[PDB]
Amino acid sequence: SGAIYVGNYRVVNRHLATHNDWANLVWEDSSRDLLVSSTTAQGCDTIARCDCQTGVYYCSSRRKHYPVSFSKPSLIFVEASEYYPARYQSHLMLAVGHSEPGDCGGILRCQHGVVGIVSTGGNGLVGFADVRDLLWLDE
Ligand SMILES: Cc1[nH]c2cc(C#N)ccc2c1CCN1C[C@@H](C(N)=O)CCC1=O
Ligand SMILES: [Zn+2]
C-alpha cells in the first residue's frame, strides 16, 4: 500500500483504489495502473520533473529503502493478476530489486522529488508506474 499527496490530489495504484477514491475520482488509467482522487487537505510531496534513471524506493516487505537504477518509462508486458488479465502496461520503469504484491504503492524518489510508485514485479525485478509526465498534479 501507499499513496502520493500533492496539492489537492492523492495518487494511488488503480488496483488498490478505495470506494472514497472512486467517489472523488479526478483521473484513472487502467493501462498505467494509476488513479488520482481529490482530497480536502493540501499535500506537500514534490513531484520530480526530470529524466533521472537512479533513485531510492521504499520496500515495505523488507521495512527498508533500496537505491536502484531503473529503465525509462515504456510499454512492458505484465503477467495476469486478480486485477488485470496479462497485458502491456504503459509508462512503466523496471529495476533489479526485491518486491512482493503488497509492496505496491511504495514511493521511488530521486534528488528532484517523487518519480513514481511500485506497481509490478516478479523474478528479482520491481516495476514503477511513472508520474513525472502528469504536469497537472502541480497546477
Ligand atoms: C510489486 C510486485 N512484486 C511481485 C512479485 C511477485 C512474485 N513472486 C508477484 C507479484 C508481484 C507484484 C505485483 C503484481 N501485480 C501487478 C499489478 C499491475 N500493475 O498489473 C496488479 C496487481 C499485482 O499483484
Ligand atoms: Zn530526478
One-letter-per-residue 3-state SS of 42-81: EEECCECCCCCCEEEEEEHHHCEEEEEECCCCEEEEECCC
Domain with 18 in it: 3-44
Same domain assignment for residues 53 and 30 = no
CA dihedral 19, 43, 73, 81 (to 10 degrees): -20
- Based on the residue annotation, tell me whether 104 is a catalytic residue of this protein: yes
Judge if 69 and 21 occupy the same domain: no
User: Which member of 15, 29, 65, 98 is catalytic?
Assistant: 15
Residue 21 Cα distances to 40, 80, 115, angstroms: 12, 24, 21
> What is the rounded distance in angstroms from the CA atom of residue 96 to the CA atom of residue 127?
9
Cβ < 5 A residues, ion ligand 2 = 48, 50, 52, 110, 112
Do 138 and 77 have their domain in common? Answer: yes
* Cell representation of residue 49: 520533473
Q: Are residues 39 and 63 in the same domain?
A: no
49, 132 contact by CB (below 8 A): yes
The contacts of residue 31 (CB under 8 Å, 6+ apart) are 87, 88, 89, 90
The Cα 56–Cα 116 span in angstroms is 11
Verify that 30 and 58 share a domain, yes or no.
no
Residue 26 and residue 63 in one domain: no
Distance CA(48)–CA(39), nearest Å, equals 21
Q: How, if at all, do strands 107-110 and 25-29 pair?
A: unpaired
Please tell me the total count of domains within the chain. Answer: 2
Nominal resolution in Å? Answer: 1.3
Do residues 105 and 2 lie in contact, with contact meaning Cβ atoms separated by under 8 Å? yes
Asked whether residue 112 is marked as a ligand-binding residue, the answer is yes
Q: Torsions phi, psi of 24, nearest 5?
A: -120, 35
User: What would the grid cell of residue 8 be?
Assistant: 489537492
Burial class (CB in 10 A: 0-12, 13-18, 19+), 93: buried
Helix (H) or strand (E) holding 23: helix 19-23
Which amino acid, residue 94? Answer: L
Three-state DSSP class for residue 132 = coil
Q: How far apart (Å, rounded) are the C-alpha atoms in residues 121 and 104?
A: 9
Calculate ∠ Cα 119-81-137, nearest 5°.
30
Set of cell numbers at residue 46: 514534490
Q: Are residues 31 and 53 in the same domain?
A: no
Tell me if 19 is assigned to a ligand binding site. Answer: no
- Is residue 37 helix, strand or coil? strand
Nearest CA among 18, 12, 7, 17 for reference residue 40: 7
